[PDB]
């Protein structure tokens, strides 16, 4: 246990054999400053107000993705090809701010204890798929080296719409719905 | 289900008391298991598991790897504090304090940053503790927290309730009243 006022991750470097795929992010005190888009080779900010402090050469990431790609192969061998244990994620659904009908708000779907980092998170409005007003965080890191991820639905709380968050995972026998109604 | 194998490599910087005590750690993880660590307080690569013994042995002999990991605290950690972290530590977002009944009264302190918050409840300018429950800080995932602090109340005509909030972004506390209808 390391005591500190603050802690950055100047590089969470995620690489997995399934895909294969990767992710490169920096985090300051639990929050994602930026990510690197590995297909596009382009640094990207989910929350643009943070470009203001710190650019980043996409090349630095693609570099470490190469190393991880190499090292994962080494480490697979040493561990006798020991496949990752699927975890059972904890979904919870809550609002950003207090609920007032007619007041625009953002719904927050929190998927904790994600492992491995493979999850489809969609929203449902009256049991139908919503694509409008949905956005995500990247896979955020945890000291037990599992991940969490957070999807957002912006919405107009109405007389009747009923919302669900649909989470799909390999630790889940069947797509898991979490409900939220005004 | 598809069989997967996972590699995580984290470079972490731990700051304390401005930039006086700084401490660099790197973890090399297979699935959920950190197998080899470099820790600026230890000084060299340590194996956390059996599987990390020879990796750390090797790296530790390479003059150039060892030396590079040692410089990391000053070259990377201390640099990022200057480029980003210091300004991020300047970030102040004010809490929105709102009282609503669900006999239970819910003070909902929302949208704030940084994380440090005090929240107190009152019944008639007298602090109420026995009847308070709080959530942990909740992380919104945008750059804000929120927190919900409940007072268990048996309302009477006349009574004034006050949710009282202190946060680094506020020069003076926020108070929000709720009068028994």
């Amino acid at each position, epitope marked *: 246990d390391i005591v500190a006022d603050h802690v950055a991750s100047c590089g969470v470097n995620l690489y997995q054999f399934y895909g294969p795929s990767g992710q490169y992010t920096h985090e300051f005190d639990g929050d994602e400053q930026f990510y690197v888009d590995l297909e596009r080779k382009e640094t990207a900010w989910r929350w643009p107000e943070f470009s203001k402090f710190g650019g980043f050469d996409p*090349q630095g990431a693609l570099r470490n993705m190469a190393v991880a790609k190499h090292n994962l192969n080494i480490m697979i061998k040493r561990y006798n090809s020991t496949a990752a244990t699927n975890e059972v994620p904890e979904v919870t659904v809550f609002s950003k701010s207090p609920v007032t009908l007619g007041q625009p708000n953002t719904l927050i779907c929190l998927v904790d204890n994600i492992f491995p980092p493979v999850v489809n998170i969609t929203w449902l409005s009256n049991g139908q798929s919503v694509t409008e007003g949905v956005s995500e965080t990247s896979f955020l890191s945890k000291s037990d080296h599992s991940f969490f991820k957070i999807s957002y639905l912006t919405f107009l709380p109405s007389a009747d719409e009923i919302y669900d968050c649909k989470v799909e995972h390999w630790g889940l026998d069947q797509p898991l719905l979490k409900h939220w109604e005004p | 289900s598809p069989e997967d194998f996972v590699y995580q490599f984290k470079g972490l910087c731990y700051f304390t008391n401005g930039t006086e005590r700084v401490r660099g750690v790197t973890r090399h993880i297979y699935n959920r298991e950190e197998y080899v660590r470099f820790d600026s307080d230890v000084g060299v690569y340590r194996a956390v598991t059996p599987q990390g013994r020879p990796v750390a042995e090797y790296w530790n002999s390479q003059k150039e790897v060892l030396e590079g990991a040692r410089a990391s605290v000053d070259r990377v950690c201390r640099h990022n504090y200057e480029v980003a972290y210091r300004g991020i530590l300047q970030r102040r977002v004010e809490p929105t304090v709102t009282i609503s009944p669900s006999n239970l009264l819910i003070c909902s302190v929302t949208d704030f940053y940084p994380s440090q918050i005090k929240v107190r409840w009152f019944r008639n300018d007298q602090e109420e503790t026995a009847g308070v429950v709080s959530t942990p800080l909740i992380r919104n995932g945008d750059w804000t927290f929120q927190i919900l602090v409940m007072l268990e109340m048996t309302p009477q005509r006349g009574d004034v309730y006050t949710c009282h909030v202190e946060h680094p972004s506020l020069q003076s506390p926020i108070t929000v009243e709720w009068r028994a209808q």
Partner: T-cell receptor
Amino acid sequence: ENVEQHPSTLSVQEGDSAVIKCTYSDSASNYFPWYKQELGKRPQLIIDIRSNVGEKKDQRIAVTLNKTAKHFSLHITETQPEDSAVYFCAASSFGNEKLTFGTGTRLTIIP
Amino acid sequence: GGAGVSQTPSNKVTEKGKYVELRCDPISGHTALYWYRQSLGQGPEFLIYFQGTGAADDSGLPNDRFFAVRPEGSVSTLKIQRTERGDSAVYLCATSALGDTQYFGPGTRLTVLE
């Protein structure tokens, strides 16, 4: 990106000193090696300099660096004919480790 | 590998449309391998960069007829597919302990003829 190198060809008397100037664009460049290349051979790494120092000296050879004006040059003093080769400056940055080279200077030391 | 970066042969002479491989045995222990191309008259230009077994940067490969491998994170072969006159250059190889400081090999001059 890009690195510019002058002069194109240089002739100096045995004994006199020779100077090649270079200039780079990407301000993030932190490492600047120089190479000597003899004909039919690959580039030989003879000296390098990083953005935390202004000057480096190694025997007859000297390298300089102005990080604010993005200039860096190479000084070869007391030249000897063995010095006759093509010289290259290159530049590299912390996140992009590939070298981007200059157009070459063809040094000729007249014996 | 050796004490320095080796490439053999010094020269490969072929005709159009034929397949050419350029080998490169790294300085033993060196984790990063780079392939550069030098059209003579001008300086070296980047093709590909390996970190261990994998490609860190392939941006310099001139077209889809170029591909490079390094199956054991050691020796690396550069494969050129359907060869054209315009591919005539010297192919330098450089390696590095970690990535920054690069030591070149003698290069292989590919000479592609009608």
